[PDB]
Structure formats: structure tokens, C-alpha cells
Amino acid sequence: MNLTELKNTPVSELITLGENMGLENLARMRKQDIIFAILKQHAKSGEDIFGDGVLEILQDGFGFLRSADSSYLAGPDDIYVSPSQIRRFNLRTGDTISGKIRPPKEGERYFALLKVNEVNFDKPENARNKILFENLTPLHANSRLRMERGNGSTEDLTARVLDLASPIGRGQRGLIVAPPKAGKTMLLQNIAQSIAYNHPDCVLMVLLIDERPEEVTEMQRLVKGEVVASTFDEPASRHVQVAEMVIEKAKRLVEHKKDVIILLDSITRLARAYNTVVPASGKVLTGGVDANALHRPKRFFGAARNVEEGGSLTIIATALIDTGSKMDEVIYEEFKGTGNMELHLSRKIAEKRVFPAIDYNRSGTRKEELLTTQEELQKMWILRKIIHPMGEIDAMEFLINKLAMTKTNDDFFEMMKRS
Amino acid sequence: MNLTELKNTPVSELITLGENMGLENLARMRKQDIIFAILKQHAKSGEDIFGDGVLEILQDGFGFLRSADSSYLAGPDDIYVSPSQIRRFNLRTGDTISGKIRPPKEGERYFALLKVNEVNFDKPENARNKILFENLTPLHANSRLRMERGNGSTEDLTARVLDLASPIGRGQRGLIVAPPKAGKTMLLQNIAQSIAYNHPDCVLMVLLIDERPEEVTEMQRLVKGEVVASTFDEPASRHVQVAEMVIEKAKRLVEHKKDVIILLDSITRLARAYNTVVPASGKVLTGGVDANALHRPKRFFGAARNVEEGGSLTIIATALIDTGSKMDEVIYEEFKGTGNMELHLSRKIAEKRVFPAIDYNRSGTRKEELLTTQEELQKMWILRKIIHPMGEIDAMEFLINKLAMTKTNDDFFEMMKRS
Amino acid sequence: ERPEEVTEMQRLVKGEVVASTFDEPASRHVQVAEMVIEKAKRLVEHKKDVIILLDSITRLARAYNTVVPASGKVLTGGVDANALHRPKRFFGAARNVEEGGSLTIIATALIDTGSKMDEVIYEEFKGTGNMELHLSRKIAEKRVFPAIDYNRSGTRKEELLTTQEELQKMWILRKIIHPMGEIDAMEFLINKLAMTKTNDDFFEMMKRS
Amino acid sequence: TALQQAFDTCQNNKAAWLQRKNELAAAEQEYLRLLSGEGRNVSRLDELRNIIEVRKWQVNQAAGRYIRSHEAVQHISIRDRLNDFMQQHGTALAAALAPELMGYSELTAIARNCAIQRATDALREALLSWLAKGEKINYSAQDSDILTTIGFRPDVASVDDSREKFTPAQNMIFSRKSAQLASRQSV
Numbered sequence A, B: 001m002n003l004t005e006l007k008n009t010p011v012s013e014l015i016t017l018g019e020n021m022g023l024e025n026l027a028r029m030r031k032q033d034i035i036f037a038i039l040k041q042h043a044k045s046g047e048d049i050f051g052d053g054v055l056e057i058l059q060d061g062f063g064f065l066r067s068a069d070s071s072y073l074a075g076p077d078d079i080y081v082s083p084s085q086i087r088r089f090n091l092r093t094g095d096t097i098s099g100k101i102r103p104p105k106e107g108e109r110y111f112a113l114l115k116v117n118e119v120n121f122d123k124p125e126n127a128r129n130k131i132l133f134e135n136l137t138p139l140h141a142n143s144r145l146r147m148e149r150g151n152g153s154t155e156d157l158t159a160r161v162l163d164l165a166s167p168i169g170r171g172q173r174g175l176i177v178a179p180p181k182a183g184k185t186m187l188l189q190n191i192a193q194s195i196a197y198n199h200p201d202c203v204l205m206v207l208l209i210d211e212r213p214e215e216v217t218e219m220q221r222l223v224k225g226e227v228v229a230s231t232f233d234e235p236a237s238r239h240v241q242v243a244e245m246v247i248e249k250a251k252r253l254v255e256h257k258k259d260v261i262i263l264l265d266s267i268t269r270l271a272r273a274y275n276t277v278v279p280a281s282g283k284v285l286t287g288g289v290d291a292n293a294l295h296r297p298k299r300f301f302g303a304a305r306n307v308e309e310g311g312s313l314t315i316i317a318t319a320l321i322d323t324g325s326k327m328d329e330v331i332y333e334e335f336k337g338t339g340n341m342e343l344h345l346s347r348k349i350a351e352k353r354v355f356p357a358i359d360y361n362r363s364g365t366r367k368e369e370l371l372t373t374q375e376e377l378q379k380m381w382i383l384r385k386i387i388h389p390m391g392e393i394d395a396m397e398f399l400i401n402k403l404a405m406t407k408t409n410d411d412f413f414e415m416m417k418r419s
Numbered sequence C: 001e002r003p004e005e006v007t008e009m010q011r012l013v014k015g016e017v018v019a020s021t022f023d024e025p026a027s028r029h030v031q032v033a034e035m036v037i038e039k040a041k042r043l044v045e046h047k048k049d050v051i052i053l054l055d056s057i058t059r060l061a062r063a064y065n066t067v068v069p070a071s072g073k074v075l076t077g078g079v080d081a082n083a084l085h086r087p088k089r090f091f092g093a094a095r096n097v098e099e100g101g102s103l104t105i106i107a108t109a110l111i112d113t114g115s116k117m118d119e120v121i122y123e124e125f126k127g128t129g130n131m132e133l134h135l136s137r138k139i140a141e142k143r144v145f146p147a148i149d150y151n152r153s154g155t156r157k158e159e160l161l162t163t164q165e166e167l168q169k170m171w172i173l174r175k176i177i178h179p180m181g182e183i184d185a186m187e188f189l190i191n192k193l194a195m196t197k198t199n200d201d202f203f204e205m206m207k208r209s
Numbered sequence D: 001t002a003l004q005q006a007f008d009t010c011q012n013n014k015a016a017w018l019q020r021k022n023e024l025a026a027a028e029q030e031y032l033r034l035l036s037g038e039g040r041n042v043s044r045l046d047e048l049r050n051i052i053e054v055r056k057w058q059v060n061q062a063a064g065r066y067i068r069s070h071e072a073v074q075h076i077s078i079r080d081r082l083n084d085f086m087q088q089h090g091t092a093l094a095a096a097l098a099p100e101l102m103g104y105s106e107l108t109a110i111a112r113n114c115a116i117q118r119a120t121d122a123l124r125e126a127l128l129s130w131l132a133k134g135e136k137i138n139y140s141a142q143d144s145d146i147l148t149t150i151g152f153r154p155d156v157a158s159v160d161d162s163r164e165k166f167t168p169a170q171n172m173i174f175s176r177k178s179a180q181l182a183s184r185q186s187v
């Protein structure tokens, strides 16, 4: 009995359990509590039960296996992994593993791990001789990751405009300069749908670091790929540990010649959480930010690269500006030079309420010659000439209305060529 | 016999019943002491007595039952609750318990309960099978809670300008930013009056922290809905107690398919009280605040959400600025992105004094399209365009004097679009 | 307070004045404060108005902090959270009764006296009083008196207790006195009031000018 | 029974306004008596000023309500006199007014209103003829007594007090003061 199908299912399963054997009290207690109780009463019959999840190690090898669907709560439902199991099975932090689990006896409460049958969606002992991600030589964004759904949807024109603005490759590092009230969140959801539709082969992994409950809880019912997030109710330690979990999971997945794309919203709040969690080193910059407090998110943000042996690790993260806090601009200028793809969001366009409100003039991709083919390259080059002279608002709305009657980007190209 | 009506009624007729019933000395003691005296006299005489209130759980099952009209003040009038019924009923804190009560015996000085007859306005066995609030998936504010009184009263202008500035919806998180002496108290009491008038079905609740006793009693008299107001007389511990009682009772009530609206003033004082009451963890931020000392206010405010299947929990809170204490605007800055609607009371109009004094341009709310009808969207959008350019003061006078002769919102809209 | 101020207290006021000097320990201050506020409560329970001038909140809070046993929880300056419960109760005992009688408390406070916990008391007592009257050292340095900071001082809900014609007169007064600094405003106010006889006369000669 | 409702509503509004005026006069008399006396009574004088100002505000409000009720009852009497006179001689008036209004039902709304304005000026001249010759007229026979009771115009003692007005903030502060004063008198 694996726990994922009973975890993803809604509370309805509860009442069915109430009639499978008749728990004396199951109505009023937390989801972790009900899952633990039902799994315990199923295990007490002696039947074999499966288990799976992502493993992390503490300061003493006090290994915890969490679940990605629950966004890694530190509850007693997590599976114990001993240091002996870690050294025997040859696995590290962020390894997605599965196998038989051991019901706990007196003196312990966490469930143990008996056997293993799959590590990182691969044969267990086959992952022993796996090349480390940090030892892999990075490469540029070779393959093109197009955002064209091709269905001609009403909102697909936003993705088309994004494609005309800046194309994202594989392992491509991106910055979104989006101030408050710029439509960045559902732009992120739209590009997530585009990724899930055009490229279902690559895994989709979007994370929200400091996000209000509403749109994060409707994120699950919208995107196809799994989403990881932590709301503002819990302190910064939860955000730091979940970011560590996601980066280790992405590294482990990309170590197995797989394509992993990480969507981050936002780098500003994540950097603030690192600043508030890190101990003070005595050297503080302006705005109450420490040097190590700025370095800590840089390690997370610098993993975007391409692997020649196979697979890629793409990171697309947004940033907050003009939020009323000057240290936000400080971290903006700190992170300005670390990204090779960037696009801006403008306020005045947002008050003009014409969308997408991206700054075409101030957006671009660094060294797009290798990423795109030469003829589409020339067409985009021509677009930059026809768009650069006049202002941002009029040029972008002109591009929008000339995209109205056309269905695909190419048809829009031959309609401008005859115009 | 119900003691809730005994506590609700003033003390004059209680005293008269005291002499008419044969009580030796009822002159000099507290209200709760008087209630305990008449309850003991009834118990000795043998009349049947009932009880009701809100239940709370200590650290060892030492359950208590308080009353809302007493502001959850500890006293002899509280009802003892043994762990036996707690474990045999699976009841928790903040359950509206009503039923039979038992007089205290020797060695025990609190009234106990014999048998509960209703829990949370529902049958105990029907209310046994309920889902936790944290297990309910939030959704958007689908239902619009219009604040229009409709009678065109002399005070309806505040409700009308609030409706135009930012609509109110179910399960909506609210920020009210305002310097001291800006008319916040009357704004919240007018909101309470409008809620009681337009929507009597919804349960209206108001929460007050360290408010002057005259303000407490005028709030009690003005609004028909029950109010919990912990005065500055008692320490911060009672503030914590009443705040937890209110929020968790609202959680239980929304678990019972009842939408809940609560008003709080102010969130900054509540955060300061939590910071003072909790022991320090060794790490202190600017203004004498700690992340572990302040995440619980974030949990309190973030509990507001709209239940996917039925009911909602809507929280409206006020923030204090320019008070001279650094932690005030520090916790204001951390609360920029914690609520889904925000409204400002700019002080420049406050010394201009023309009322209501709200910053219409700065105030705003997200997700308008999913909250109300479309033509209303175009109308408020036209209003925003016509109100944006000039300053806030003359804009306020403009808005109020074109809200003078107009009777309803439709009248204002039709006079706007006919000119 | 020192005994000479006490003696000046009896031989000036008409009603009885209660004064405990510093010679006795803080326990005497605590007991006299508690019983005098109890007496005021008993008097106001019988539908008579009681007005108490208090000097000062700082010293009373000192006594309450130094009389109570330590509870193990101490804030900045060595104060105890439960120690400040009693003086705040004393200040908040003031209220207005519609059934009969009233209890008015006019209490003074000390600021920047070279200590640390005095400003703690000040900042904690800012929002608990609905009427405030500020004093400034810079105006007193110029030896122009009284040195009250008119701009920052004021009161709330003052429109529901008095006739409104003087409300608009003082409202236009606040218009014409807000911009300039507090000091020159104070000399202007004293030189205007010196040549008048009553407040109303000053009011109409402001109105006509 | 709508006419009777307007009649007795106006009657009780007038009675309330007269009672408020009497209370204001008594308060002013007490205030002047106290001012004449040598006794200071500073708080007593201040609360007398408060009571006289709130009483005159209440007098203004009552006079405004009475004037509004007077207008309402006059409008109702005009309306139903037109209605029954109309049910009597609609054909007579239509024969005169016809040549602009046969096709009212088939005419569109804007053409309907155009014919409305043509009839407006036709009746303008029609009434100007009476008002140029201008002989003495009396009330309708059916409701002459009622219209004499209310009268041709409201009393000057109400309109003169209703001449001055207050801002809504003034309105609600005086409302709160009046409620508090009534509660204090009740206690």
C-alpha cells in the first residue's frame, strides 16, 4: 500500500476508511494525523506497504523522507532513514527513492525504510556510479524551448509576444523585472501551461517561496506539473529548507540526464528570507543586507546550466522592484549582472491596462544567435528595428493589434513582410 | 433556566431577584460573583438549570467554558469541563457548547456540565463528522459583499466611497493603513452597521485590543453583533487569550458551513503584544521583534480564506503608521504582501479634515474581474482614469461632492456617463 | 514629593489633598494610592463627580515596579510586565457614568529625566489616554510661559461635549496657528491674550482681524 | 387612504415641530434667566448652550420635515385631483391636444418626448391665458377642507428656520448630541 495515492486523494478517502474497519475517531484531526492513523491500522494487519519520497540528511545523518505533494511538512508522517541505510544504499540529499517501509516499535515514532526498488526513477545500484552535477561542465542554451502552443488561444498571444521578445533555451537563466500589479503570477502560470503542453517530456517544477494562500492553492488545479510552495504563516526556516529540498531534487534529477525547469517567484522574498535566517557576520551593507545573506541565494540561482552528457537545468525566476523598500533595489542591482536572459515589466503600461505589459525595448536575450536559427534570427532583428524608434506603449500595442488577426507567429512574419 | 440571559441583562433586576429570592448579601461583589450566587441558590433550591458558552482546552484537558458577553473573562461563572466528555465527543477548543449543567461539589468550586444537548448550533453526532479548517482548499472571493446601505443616509457616503474604492468579498484578507487620529474606529463601526443591515445572515464579529472602556462600551451598544474587546487594563496575556479564542471560534464556525466576518483594530498592537508575551529566542531584529515572536500574527491574518465547498472566513485589520516606534512600520512593511486587499487613509486629507479621508489612488484590490459584474468593472476603471491625474485632496473633494446629490451608485454612474 | 511642595499643596487648594513624601518606603505609596483610588470609586458610585490631579505616573510606576515580587519575566530597563499592570489599571479607572457621577483623572508624566525605563512608561502610556497636554523645554528655556506644545497636544471627541461656535473659532485658529513654529506661536498667543479680558472677546477680535 | 396618511403625517409633523419650538423657547428662557443671575454656574451655562444649540438644530430638522410633508401632501392632492378630473374629461382634453399626439403609441421614445415638449408649450400658453386674465379661484370641492387645513403655503416660522443648513458631519454630530441629551433626560 503506497502512500501517494492515499495522499493526493481528497478527504473523501477518510470516510471510506471509517467504513473499511471502523476507526473510533477519524473525523476531526489533521491530514497528516489521519494519514498516519490509517497507515498504522493498515500496517497492523501485517500486509506489505510501500513508501516513497525525497530524502534529506540532518547534521547527524538523521535522515528524513518527505513527500513533494504536501510541500515537505516536518510531520511524523515522514519516513526515517538511518545513516547505515544511507551508507549501504549510496544515496544523497534530494534523491527520490521508493521501497518497503518498516512499522515502528516502542521507543521510536518515525517509520523506517526496509528495502529499496527505485532511486531517482532508476534502478537503485545503477545510481551508485552517477556523475556529480557540480563536476559537469556547463554549456550554453543549444536547443530552443519554444512557447508556441499552436492552438491559437485567446491568451496564447501573450506567449507569442514573449517569444518575439526573448526566447528561453535549455539551461537558460532568466530574470523577470516585475513590480507589484504587473500580471506576473498568471504570466508564470501561462508559461507553465506552455511548458507542460509543448514539452511534456521534461519535468515541470514550479515553486513559490513567499506567496499568499489564494493563488498558490489554485496553482495545483491549474498547472499540470507538480508545484512546491510555502505560505507566509510559517517562518523563514521552512522557506530555506524547502528551497534546499527543491534545489537538491533538481540537481539529483538533472544528474540522471534529465531536463528540469525551475520556476521561481520570487528571488526577492527568497533573498529576504535568507537575510533574516542567516546569522550576522558583522559586515552589513546598506539596507540591512549581509554579504553572505546575498551570497546564499546566489548558490541557488547559479545552478542554471546545460550538460553535454545529457539533460539540462533551466531556471526562470522573477524579481520585485519599486516595492517601497530600498534594499529591494539593492538586491536588484546585486542580481542584475548574473542573468543572461532578462525581461522587464512596466508600470505605466499596467495603468494603461494593455497586456502583456512587458518592456520590449529593455528586454532581450544575451547571445541569441546560437539559440535560434539564423532566419528567425533575422526576422526578430528586423522587429527590433521596427520597434526601437517609437515608445514602449505605442509599439507594444501596435504589435498586439497586428497580432489580432493572425494565428501563428510565422503568418505574422509574412504579413509584416508584405506590409 | 439559562444563565446567558442572566448575564446579558443589567444588574438592577438581578439584584431585585436576589432580594426577592432570599439571598443574604448581594450588594458588594463582581458581576460573575453575582451570577455564581444566583446559580448556587437555584442549585440549592433544586430548579433545573441549563448552560451554554464557548469551550476552551488547557494543556492537560482542564477544559473551561466561557461566555462571549463577558469578553471571555476568567471567573466563577465559567463552566468546568472534564476530559471524559472531551475524549468521548472528540470536541476541541472553541466549540459552542450548550446543554445541562451540574452544581459544583465539595472540593471543587466551578460549575460542571452533565450532558451537552447541542454543539455549534448542531446535533453533537451530526457535528462529530466535520473537516478541519486547514484541510479545506481555499478559493477566490466569488461572492461580492456589497457595502451599500441603500437608504441614502447621511453616513452612507463612507460606505459608497468604500464600495467604489475597494469591494469586499468573502474570504478576503484586508489591510487598513492609517496614522493615528484618522477616524479608523468609526470606519470599522460603519462597516459593522452596513454588514448587519445588508447581510444579517452572516455572523458579524469585532475584535478590539487595548481600547478605552468608553470605546469598548460604545462599540457594544452601537452594533447588534457580538464584540470581543480586551481593554488595556488587563495584560497582554488576556489579549493573546481573546485573540486566539476569536480566531479559532471563527475557524470552527466556518467549518460548520457559516461564513464569518471579523473586524480587528489594530493588528500592530496585537503583534506588539505577542512580541512582548512570548519569550525571546536569542535573535532580535530592529525594533525589538523576532521572527519566532511574530509568525503567529502572520498565521492569524493568513487564516482568512474562502472555503471551496461552503462558508468563508474574512479578516479586516488596521495597521498603525507614523507612531514613532520602529517596529510599527517594520511590521507594516512586512505586511505589504500578506493581504489581498489594501486601503490607505492618507494624513494630508486628515489635516485637510474633509471626510472620509482615504487615499483613493493608493487604495486598491486585486482580482476585480472574478469578484463583481463586468459593467461595474468598466465604470470603476473610467473612475480610476478620471481620478488618477490630480492630487489626492482635491480628488477627495471632487468625489464627495459628486456623491452628494446622487442617491445610489447607479445614480453616480449614470451622471458620470451622461456628462 | 519634597515636604515644602506638600505644604504649598495644603495651603493653596480648597479641597483636601493627599500627599505621601519620599521619606516613607514605596509600600506606603502603594497602599495610599490603592486606598485613595478605592475611595474615589466609592464616592463616584454614589453619583458625585470626583476629579483627581496626579503627580506623577512615573513615580507611582516606580513604586509599583519596586514593590511587587519579580515574576521572572523582565522587559527593557528592568521593569516587569505584571508590575505595570497596577499603574495602568490606576490610570484606566477613569470613566464617565450616565447613571450618575463621573471620575476624571488628570495625571502628569516625566520624560527624558536621564533614565531609561521612564521613556518606556511614556511610550507604553501614549495610547491609553484620550486627552494629552505636552510641555516643551525649548520654550521654557526662552523664559516665555506656559511652555505647552500646542501643535502636538490636543484631545479627541471634543466636539460632543461643548457648543460648536467656539469649535469653528478654534478650528480656524488651528488653521492660522499650524504653519509657524511653536515658540513664536506661543509669544503671539500670549501677546494676543494679554490685551483681552475673556476668551470670547479674543475670539471675536481674531474673527474680525 | 393615502391622502389621509399624508394629512395626519403632516399633522403630527407640525405638532412635533411646535413642541420642539416650545422646548427651544423654554431652554432660551432658562439660559437668559441664568445669565441674568449672579451665580456663575459655568458648567451649567455650558450645558445650557449645548441644549439650546441642539434644540435649535432639532427645530430646524422638524421644520424641514414638516415642509417636506407639506410638499408631499400638496403633490398628492394635485395628483389625485388631476386623476379624477382626468378620468372625467380625458376625451375633452384630447380633442384639444390631438393634432400632435394621435401616433404616440407608434412613435419612438424620442419622438414621444418631442410631442411631450410641444404639448408642454401648448399648456404653457393655455395656463398663461388664465394667469393673464387672472380671476380669483378656490380649492377643489371634494377636498377643500383638507387643503384649507394644510393651507396654500407653509408657515413662515418654519421656512425661516429651514433657511440655514448644515454639513452632513454637522448633521451627525448634532444627531449624536441629541441622542445623548435625550438619554440623559431619560435617566
Ligand SMILES: Nc1ncnc2c1ncn2[C@@H]1O[C@H](COP(=O)(O)OP(=O)(O)OP(=O)(O)O)[C@@H](O)[C@H]1O
Residues within 6 Å of the ligand: A158, A178, A179, A180, A181, A182, A183, A184, A185, A186, A187, A355, A356, A357, B366, B367, B368, B369
Ligand atoms: N494578459 C492579461 N490579460 C488580462 N488582464 C491582465 C493581463 N495581465 C495583467 N492583467 C491584469 O492585471 C492584474 C494583475 O494581477 P496579478 O495578481 O496577476 O499581478 P502580479 O503581477 O502577479 O502581482 P501581485 O499579485 O503581487 O499584485 C490582473 O488581475 C488583471 O486584471
Ligand SMILES: Nc1ncnc2c1ncn2[C@@H]1O[C@H](COP(=O)(O)OP(=O)(O)OP(=O)(O)O)[C@@H](O)[C@H]1O
Residues within 6 Å of the ligand: B179, B180, B181, B182, B183, B184, B185, B186, B187, B355, B356, C156, C157, C158, C159, D169, D172
Ligand atoms: N465622517 C466624519 N464625520 C464626522 N467627524 C469625523 C468624520 N471623520 C472623521 N471625523 C472626526 O475625526 C476624528 C476621528 O475620531 P476617531 O475616534 O474615529 O479617531 P481614530 O483615528 O479612530 O483614533 P483614536 O482611537 O485615537 O480616537 C474625530 O474628531 C471625528 O469627529
Ligand SMILES: [Mg+2]
Residues within 6 Å of the ligand: A184, A185, A186
Ligand atoms: Mg501576483
Ligand SMILES: [Mg+2]
Residues within 6 Å of the ligand: B183, B184, B185, B186
Ligand atoms: Mg480609534
